[PDB]
């Protein structure tokens, strides 16, 4: 149905010097593709 996507991103952490990879599900409606035309890069609407 492609209503959901599995996305990865660098989320911030308790310390400003560190970042943590986070995997999470998002609804397709909340997401807009970035026009690199690769289809893999996205941003929140």
């Amino acid at each position, epitope marked *: 149905r492609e209503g959901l996507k599995n996305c990865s991103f*660098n989320m911030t*952490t308790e310390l400003r*010097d*560190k*970042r*943590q*990879k986070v995997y999470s599900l998002f609804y397709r409606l909340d997401i807009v593709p970035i026009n690199e035309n690769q289809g893999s890069e996205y941003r929140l609407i």
Partner: antibody
Amino acid sequence: EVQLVESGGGVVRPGGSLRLSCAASGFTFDDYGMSWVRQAPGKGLEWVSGINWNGGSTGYADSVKGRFTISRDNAKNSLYLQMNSLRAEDTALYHCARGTDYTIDDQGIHYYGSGTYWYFDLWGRGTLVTVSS
Amino acid sequence: EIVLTQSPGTLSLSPGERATLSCRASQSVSSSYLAWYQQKPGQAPRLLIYGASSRATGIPDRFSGSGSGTDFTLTISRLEPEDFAVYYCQQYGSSPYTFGQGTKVEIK
């Protein structure tokens, strides 16, 4: 439990090609970058190539650059190396090695789970590759 | 491009003696990235130090080191019979990462 297992080794005529693979288990594969390191008998270690956690970054030693390609399949928890235009000089024991689970930006910012191929805390037994007429 | 060199190529000390190894880069090492490894014949190598001075997990205080610029040193406070091995320095600082020629410490 934690291990790396090399496969795909063998004897190949020069000018030919061979694909190597490395199975891995006991840890999250997606969190680490990886490298291949080779050692001829009687010789020291030589870095061959390496790949970051998503395959977005690669690098090759000058001695193999342009003849080798490195790739990975995170879904299969496996690392692959394609070796082309093999030469007698390439004969060595090849080791699969786990890279770091984090990388550092130019700003000094650390990223965890975004692994890279700098240094190796885990090594496999390796597999032999021989090049002969 | 960047080549590491190491000395002495061979060392021979009795067990319990203090020992050091030297590694010198042809070019300066960025951010003290240089790291050290240990190997015995018939075995895959292990990592004693990550970064110039920080020990890997499971590495006792017996192993230590420091350095800057092109010049780095590994120190062993005392040699255990288990510590006789081939040692290497690697540079994570610039592509391609390279391993020095290494040194050997032996009683046999």
